[PDB]
Structures are given as structure tokens and as C-alpha cells.
Amino acid sequence: LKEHEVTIFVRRGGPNYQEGLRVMGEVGKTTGIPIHVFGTETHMTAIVGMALGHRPIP
Amino acid sequence: SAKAISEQTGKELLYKFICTTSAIQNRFKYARVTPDTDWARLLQDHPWLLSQNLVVKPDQLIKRRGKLGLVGVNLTLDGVKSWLKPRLGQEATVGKATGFLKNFLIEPFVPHSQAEEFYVCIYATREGDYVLFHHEGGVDVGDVDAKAQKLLVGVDEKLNPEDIKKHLLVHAPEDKKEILASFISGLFNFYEDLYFTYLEINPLVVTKDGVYVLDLAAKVDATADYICKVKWGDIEFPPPFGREAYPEEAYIADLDAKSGASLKLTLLNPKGRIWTMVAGGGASVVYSDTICDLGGVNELANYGEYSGAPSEQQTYDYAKTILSLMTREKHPDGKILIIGGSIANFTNVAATFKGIVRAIRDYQGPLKEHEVTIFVRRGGPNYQEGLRVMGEVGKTTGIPIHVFGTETHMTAIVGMALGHRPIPGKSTTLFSRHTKAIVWGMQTRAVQGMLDFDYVCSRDEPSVAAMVYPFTGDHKQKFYWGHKEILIPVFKNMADAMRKHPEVDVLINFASLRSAYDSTMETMNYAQIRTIAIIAEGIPEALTRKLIKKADQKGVTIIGPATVGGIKPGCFKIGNTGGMLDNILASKLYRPGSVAYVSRSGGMSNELNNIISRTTDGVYEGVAIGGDRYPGSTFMDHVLRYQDTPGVKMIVVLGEIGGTEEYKICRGIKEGRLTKPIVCWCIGTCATQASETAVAKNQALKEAGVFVPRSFDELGEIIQSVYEDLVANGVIVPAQEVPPPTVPMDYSWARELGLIRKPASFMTSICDERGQELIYAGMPITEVFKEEMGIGGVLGLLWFQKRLPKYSCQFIEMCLMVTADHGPAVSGAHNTIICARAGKDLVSSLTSGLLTIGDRFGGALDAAAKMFSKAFDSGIIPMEFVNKMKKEGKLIMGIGHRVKSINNPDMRVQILKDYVRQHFPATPLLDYALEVEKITTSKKPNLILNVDGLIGVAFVDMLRNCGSFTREEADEYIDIGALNGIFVLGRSMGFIGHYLDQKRLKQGLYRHPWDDISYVLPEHM
Amino acid sequence: WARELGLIRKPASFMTSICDERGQELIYAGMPITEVFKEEMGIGGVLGLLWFQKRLPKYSCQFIEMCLMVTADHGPAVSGAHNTIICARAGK
Ligand SMILES: CC(C)(COP(=O)(O)OP(=O)(O)OC[C@H]1O[C@@H](n2cnc3c(N)ncnc32)[C@H](O)[C@@H]1OP(=O)(O)O)[C@@H](O)C(=O)NCCC(=O)NCCS
DSSP states (O other): OTTTTOOEEEEOOSTTHHHHHHHHHHHHHHHOOOEEEEOSSSOGGGHHHHHTTSSOOO | OOSSOOHHHHHHHHHHSOOOSSOOOSTTOOOEEOTTSOSHHHHHHSGGGGTSOOEEEETTTOOOOTTTTOSOTTOOHHHHHHHHHHHTTOOEEETTEEEOOOOEEEEOOOSOOTTSOOEEEEEOOSSSEEEEEESSOSGGGSOOTTTSEEEEEOTTOOOOHHHIIIIIOTTOOSTTHHHHHHHHHHHHTTTGGGTOSEEEBOSOOOOSSOOOOOOOEEEOOOSGGGTTTTTTOSOOOOOOOOSOOOTHHHHHHHHHHHSSSEEEEEESOSSOSEEEOOSSSHHHHHHHHHHHTTTTTTSOOEEEEEESOOOHHHHHHHHHHTTSSSSBOOOTTOOEEEOOOSSOOSSOTTTHHHHHHHHHTTOOSTTBTTOOOEEBOOOSSOOHHHHHHHHHHHHHTTOOOOBOOSSSOTTSSTTTTTTTSOOOOOOSOSSOTTOOEEEESOOHHHHHHHHHHHHHTTOSSOSBOOBOOSSSOOEEEEEEETTEEEEEEEOSOHHHHHHHOOSOOEEEEOOOSSSIIIIIIHHHTSTTOSEEEEOSSOOOTTHHHHHHHHHHHTOOOOOOSSOSOOOBTTTBOOSSOSOSTHHHHTTTOSSOOOEEEEESOSHHHHHHHHHHHHTSSOEEEEEEOOSSSSOSSOSHHHHHHHHSOSSOOEEEEEEOSSSSOHHHHHHHHTTTOOOSOEEEEEOOOOOOOOTTSHHHHHHHHHSSSSOOOSSSSTHHHHHHHHHHHHHHTTSOOOOOOOOOOOOOOOHHHHHHTTOSOOOOOOOOOSOOOOSSSOBOSSOBHHHHHHTTOOHHHHHIIIIIOSOOOHHHHHHHHHHHHHTSOOOTTSHHHHHHHHHHHTTOOHHHHHHHHHTTOSSSSSOHHHHHHHHHHHHHTTTOOHHHHHHHTTBTBOOOTTBOOSSOOSSSOOSSHHHHHHHHTTSOOOOHHHHHHHHHHHHHTTTOSSOOBOHHHHHHHHHHHHHHHSSSOOSSSHHHHHHHTTTHHHHHHHHHHHHHHHHHHHHHTTOOOOOOOSTTTOOOOOSOO | OHHHHTOSOOOOOOOOOSOOOSSSSOBOSSSBHHHHHHHTOOHHHHHIIIIIOSOOOTTHHHHHHHHHHHSSOOOSSSHHHHHHHHHHHTTO
């Protein structure tokens, strides 16, 4: 997948949504396949709005 | 200890224990004169004074006599006396120091014209051993370090006199070598096994008759006093001489001598306008640096610290003296009081600021009445509350206190109140996120800190592989891996523990100086130990010479003594540096950093955690090299470790005063070793030689392009500029902040302040055991025995949890008394006697007998209650109830006796029956059962109500016919089986009576003979 | 819920060096129950695992099962079996 040039966009909510953000934030840090983590402060389908480059990524 | 030495007592050891072939003469010969004695007392304890000549010196560390005439040279006794009246105790100046002349070491000048001594002596550092030989004496050599015969005695080699004759003594007279040299060999013994710092005998010369010695100057090492009560002995120490000390300095020095606490307040000029009363090292020095290099040679008032936790009254006393520096006195421009640090130690600041709260709260007359001003700071966890309480009555009697956090640098308040700004196979991965370590010692708070450092850095495995001892058991200790409970082993023997654990490479050493050698050298000849983090401070320098020669042989990379850690964050931490997790997670140390340091002190290791982590991206190493001078793993051995590593990028370094050492770094700097960004700073000028003062060797760091800043001020500013310049070309990429997860607090502590939730089991509406008395159903034991309820009352309180009235308790007592033993043929008492007779114990015998109370034996109590209850509530006439029980089989339970029938009543049925006829109101069920009895005794004579029938019907009568029970409470106690319990608690008395009887009659085992069994086995299966 | 996400703490009693019930299999001393039946240790094997927490050899488990086969009933006259027949005869 490092041969295949991937980018992960994640948007999430639920029970332990914040520490779910924590734990998958540190694993997206530990192996370096890039994960864009997003919580509930964004719109739900905004991350495919910025995944196709139609709006910026904070 | 041993330190400055008193030369009466040092020469006691030397002159009492000297051993050589050609004689040390002039032994036991030393003396001391004051005007507080005569010549006579020192003349009589040292009588040889009437034999040889005399030289006299002030033993207040005063130099250069011979040309000044403070020796009375060739002068007689009364000449010396009428010399003592205008010189023993008058003023003189040498160098630049004047003073009184009171303690005169009056010493054997051996009767000599200037041919009869010979020059030696020897000084030490931390590397190898420097002996100085000289032909040219006199205290006027000046540069004695440039012309002398120097010789290094190397690592681990002993003197041969043939070595001395071959290449050190080219320049010596020979007719006295056959005496002196053997003499001289013994005198060398005064050095290396004595661990000196500096030792000199100067001017000294050879003749025919003797060998001679004159003038001692000595600086001596300590902590093996307990080893040397056999060889040093009961030896005494002087303090240094100065002006007459204002009493707080001597109170503090002898207070260091008294307790285990170290309290510190030492004056430097009494009429300052900047007082420093600090607790901590780094802020004290740098604030007094911006003082004492900007003109605090003339005014600067003091310096101090305090540690070691003195008790209630002792810190109350020290506390009221420190209601003696800002409440009294004056400087017309305004005075400062400097209390520094960086977020506060492990004191709850209720503790050391119980020191400083009770140091304030009291005396406002005698510290300031004449204008001083406070600022305050400290370093570790738990700060805010003690800052407050010093605020509390320091405020409501009116004294202004400015409390702080750490938004400032170490230099601010000396920056403000001069009118000056406003007032507010050897491994190279030493530490990593997979490094596996050993803790020597019980450090469970900081074991939790270090396993916390393994968990909160998002790492995989804990830091402690074993506790590696001689003196306990083998077990495992419960600690926390995050939230899981894990078990980490504590060991008896160290060969056992190294035998048990080969996963093992780095040891944190809480061994004492008694067992640094046996335990820690035993550890150091187990090859498992790669970096030895020695929390013992001062394995002595020949023992640690065996260690450092073994760190070049065995090669182990020692980051040793007095370390508050060797902390690579994200990766590893040794003990208790930094603070709480406030300082680890607030400085983003769970994903890796990039910037290393080497420092000297620990009180600024708090603020250099604060700085190096909060102005740069974090700590990547901290190396406290030791407070001495040849580092065992140095600056450079870790610069080697990081310059070749592709992840890490830049480094910080610290220094101290006097001598040529940061010149070795300019052997690194001038020759071009370091290309990474480096940041350095030097501690403690206070000159009130030249070279590792901050100016001269920050110069001798500064020049060839390996970076040092000016001061500690702009170290935040120049680290900020260097960091933004090194981000500016795109080699450092800053990480984005992730929330951290810790110690999870406790179930007990989060419930103590009430924060989690938990459902409880075991509902128990009975017998509150806790509180100021044992509480029964609702009633105290004093109210139990004071209202005078017997055991019937407490059966009501235990079984039904209601205060039954005074007739019902007595009825229950009577039922328990007639449900006592009914003889030993019956089956439960039979098993009791079989088990008692097998000699088991009381409780197993009784309980095996009570485990037969069922339905066929002893279950007539509940059955003869439920049957009559089901007949009386579904009411039929007993003349048809007895026929209804006739129509179904199933004989009426509780009716029938083998013997005692009628006109012969059962006479315990009668005792209970005439109890219920008398003391028992409202009794319909007994009237029903007695009419059943009147019907049944016409059938047969025997056919009477049993006591097992009568207690059943009378107890249901008690329950559902007195008060306190509804009919869903009374019938629920019958449906549950509370009538079994009466028979059981009754018959337990008779069972234990049978047990005690079968033990007391001392019968052996019962066997049940074979003519009572009649085996009926099948034919052949 | 707080321990499902892990933030509070609790020290545990009942130290039980035996028989992990939780997880995908009934683990005995150190061995899964399918490994109990595939290695074919009998009740001597599980007495080794339960009582001593040690895998006893194939002559030892056979001796332990023979041993439990001889320490069975020794007739109804003796003291404990007598108390059993009394308590059973009261129909408990
Ligand atoms: C043989 C004899 C004893 C009968 O035995 P028995 O009376 O049935 O034994 P019991 O006393 O236990 O039983 C009689 C009643 O008591 C009842 N009963 C017995 N135990 C009971 C119990 N725990 N609970 C309630 N009822 C019980 C029975 O249900 C029975 O009822 P029933 O007779 O109305 O049907 C009687 O016939 C007799 O006395 N014979 C000698 C006299 C003689 O034969 N003379 C000839 C010439 S002199």
C-alpha cells in the first residue's frame, strides 16, 4: 500500500468517538499510511469534499 | 565524613600508624596555641616542645609566614610570650586578606639551618594521580604547576622505588637517598588510599642526619567514615575562617550537621537591595548571576535553599527565623527577596510551604519594616495550595506576596526590581521505546512513574525486569501496565536474579555505599549491565577507577552518579525527573522528540525540562555527567551517539567554575567536530582561577563556530531563533498535538471525590457493623443490654429484624429450650456423635450433624406449621379437615408419640402449652389445633400434638397473630422456612453437648459391627 | 464503561493461578480444553493441572487414576460412609 500511494480520510462519531480519535491517531502516526482524522466538528460528507480537492484540509 | 581536617587529629592517624624501614622520625609531634590557653596546657599534652625548635602559624587558612615574621625565628620562650601579647591575636594581611591571628598551629620546626627537609606532595582530580616533586621550595614559586617534576601515577599501578630512581628524580642529591626515599615512599601512602583533593609540602631540603618535613596543606575525602573507624578513627574537622558570621549561616551549617534535612540561608553582604532566599539551584544561581556580574560584589545579600523535610516544630523554628528576612530592615532604593524554581517538587507545597507558610504567617516586625519585596517559585508536582496558604494570612495581616507559575525565565525579578522592568558488543541505543531495564531498589512511586513513562509514551513494555538484591525473597510485585495488573519480580540473590533474567541490560542502582562494592561490583562483574544509572553518589574514585577502567575494558557506558534521570522521552526515564505527567504530556513527550542535552544540576534540570521541552520540541536525552571532572560517559560519547543517527538533529551543554575543561570541547570546536546546533551555559561565578567562569570559557567555547549563547536569558530567545531558522530550511518538521490518555487514579480515590459509578451486591438489611458501635437491627449494643432483651429479642432482631414484645422473646427462648437435645438415638445427634467420636473438631462435627435437619428428621416444625396454615386459611371444619387428610393418605404432621399419651401428658408439650395459654393473647390457630387434638385423641390414645407440632402451630400463631407482620410478611417467613431455623438453632446446643461429652468421656472410634448391616449385593454383574 | 475504555484503576484479590475461564476456550492450568482432549490426559492429567498445575507423565496419571480407583468406598460400616447412609436415610 506504500507501493500503491494511499491516503485515508476518516470521519467519525459514536461511543468513545474522542478516544477512538486518539488511538487511531497514534496508529496512523506509527505506520505512516496517512490518515486524515476528523471528528464531529466538520460536516459528515465534507471529507469527500476535501478528499477530491474541492475545499482545503485544516 | 572527612573534609578540611584538623591536623592534630589527621597527624594522629598519620603519626600513629606509620610503617617503613628507615624511620619516620618526629612522630606524635604537633601542637596548637591560643590566648584562650597558656603555653602550659599545649606544653604539657605535647611535652617534646622543650626539645626541638618551633614554627607557628595561624590555622585559619592563612598563608606565607617566613618573610612576614609571624614565626618568631630564633626567639626564646618569654620572647615568644611577650611576642604573643602583640601578635597572637592581632591583625595581618597576606595576598589580599587581613585578619585576626588566634589559632596558631605551633608545629615542629625541626632544628634546622636551611639544609634539612625534602620537597613533596600530591594532588588529585577524578583520571589519574598527580605527584609533585621539587628541588626548589618556598611559597613564592607562583607558577608551581609549570616548573615542577610532575608525574601521573596511571590507572592501576603501584609505586616502585626503582621507578622513582629511574625517571622522576634526575635532579636529586644522593647521600640522603638511602634514608629519604624509603621514608618518602611511606609519605606517598598519605595520598591515594586517602583520596585527597589537594596536598602540598613546600620548602623542603637534604643533609646527613635525618629526612625532613615541615608545612602541610590538605584537602581530604569523606564518606567511608564507617569503614575507617578501624583505620581513620574518631577524627575531627574544622570549618573555614571568615568574618564573624551573622548567626543564620552558622545555624544553617551546624543544622546541616545535625539532621538529615539540609536547610540553607547564607549571607553574602548584609545591606543588599537584592536578598536571595531561594529554594532550588538554578534560579538561585542565575538570578544571583544577573546580580553578581552586574555589581552584586558590593551589595548582594545572600544565597540559600532547603530540603530534607524537617518536622513540625523544627521547621516552625527555621520558619520563624524566616520571619526574620522581609518584616524589619532597609535599603533606600527598595529590596528584593528571590524565591525561585520551576513548578514545585514532591512536597505538597503545604509541606515545604508549611515551612514557608509558617515562615510567613506570624511576626511582621523583624524581616522588612524598612522596604523589601518577594517573588516565589519551586520545581516538581503540587504547588498551588501552598502558594495560596502563604497568601492566606500573609494577606489578611497585609504583607504583599506575588506568587507565580513558570511563564517567566530564571532572570526576571533581578530583571525588574533594580527599577528595571515592571512588577507583575556494546549497545548504542541507550534509551529507546524498546529498551529493557533493571531497577535495583524499591522505588514504587517512581516505579509507577517509570511504568507510567512506558505506558503514557504509547510504548509496549514495562521498564522493570527485576529487583536485584541479596536480602529478600523471590516473588513478583503488583504494578500497573496501563490499566492491567502485572507482576514484576523481586529477587533474593543476585546470581539467582541474573541467572533468572537474561532479557536484562540497564540497572538503576539504589544500593547504599555499604553495598555498592559487593552488590554493585558483583552486578558489574555480571556482564548483563550496559548502562549503570547509579543513584548512589560517589563510588569512590579508585573503586570507580576499577569501574572506569572496566568501562574501557568491559566497556559499559556509565551515565552514573546522582542522576534524577537519563530521560529520553517517548522512550525511557530513570526515576523522578520532571514533575507529574503535567510536565511529560504538557511537553508532548509521547511521540518522539529530536533534541538532546547535557547539564550539571537537577534543580535547573526541572527548568531545563521546562525550557528544552517547551522552547524546543522536547528532550531526547539528558546526561548528568557527575559533579566531578573526568566524565565516565562524557559530552562526546553521546554526541557520537546522535550525530550518526538519522533521526536526531541538535544538542545542549552546561558548565561550572575554575580549571581547563570546556577547552576539551574547543579541542572539539576548534578542530571541527560539531556541526549541529548546540546551546551551552555556565553556573556560579560569585567571585566575592579565571577560566571556567562563564565569561572566559564561554569565550573558550565561543570562538570557532560551535554555538554558545551569552546567558541564560536569551537561551529561550536564541533557542527560539535557532529553532525557527532550522525549521526555516525544512529539516525539522513540527508534530501536531494529540490528546494524551496516565495513572488512572484509583477506584477508591475517584470514589473518594465521587466520580465514576459502581453497582453493589449483597443487599443485607441487617446488623450495621461499622460506626462508633456495633449496631444491630436498629439498636446499639448498650441499648440491647440496657432495654434488657435476652436472646429472644435478638432472634427477633436477626431473623425477623423486628423488636418482638417481651412475651414473644421469652416464648422464642422457651422454644429454643425445648428444641434442645432429645437424646442421642436420633439421627442428627447420631451423626454428631459419630463425627465427634472420629475426633475431628467442634465445628466439623456439629456441622455434619446439623446437616441432617431436613424433612424426615426435624422437619416436622415447618411441615406441622404449613399444613395447619393451609387448612386454617382455606377453612374447613376439623371434623372434615381430619377426614380430608384421611381421604388423601399423608398423616397429619406433628401428631403421635410412642409413649406419653393422655392422663399421662407429655409434660414438655404441657410446659409450652400452658405458656401459650397464659402469656399469649389472640391465639386462634392453637385453638384450631387443640380442637384437632380433641378430635384425634378419640381415634387413638397416643395421637397427641407433638412438641414438633405444637411449636409449629404456636409459632405461626405468634407470627400471623401478634402484630408486626401483615399476612404477606408472616406467610413469606413460613414459605421461606423460618420454622426450620428454630429447630436448628435449638438442636445445635444438644449437638455440641454431645460433642463435648464424647470428647470428655474419651471414647475412641466407633465402627458399627458387621452384624447390623446385612449386605444385599447383586449376584455377578 | 470506564474500564471498557480504561481510565480508573482497581486492585484485584482472589489470585487463582488456575483455570482461565474467559476467552475462546476453557483453559485449564496452561492448556486449552481441546489440547486436554487431543493430548489425551485423563483425570489424572487434570488433577495434575488442577492440583499441582503440572503435566504429569503417562505412568503418573495412570497411577493416579488407579489410585483413585482404590481409594473409593471401603464399605458402609466405616465412619464417614455410615454418616452418609444416615443422612441419605433421612432423605435430604
Ligand atoms: C392393629 C391396630 C393397632 C390398628 O393399627 P392402627 O390403629 O391403624 O395404627 P395407627 O394408630 O397408627 O393408625 C390409626 C389411625 O391413626 C391415623 N394416623 C396414624 N398416624 C398418623 C399421623 N402421623 N398423623 C395423622 N394421622 C395418623 C391413621 O391415619 C389411622 O386412621 P384410621 O384408623 O381412621 O384409618 C388396632 O386395630 C388394634 O388395636 N388391635 C388390637 C385389638 C384387637 O385386635 N382385639 C381383638 C380381640 S381383643
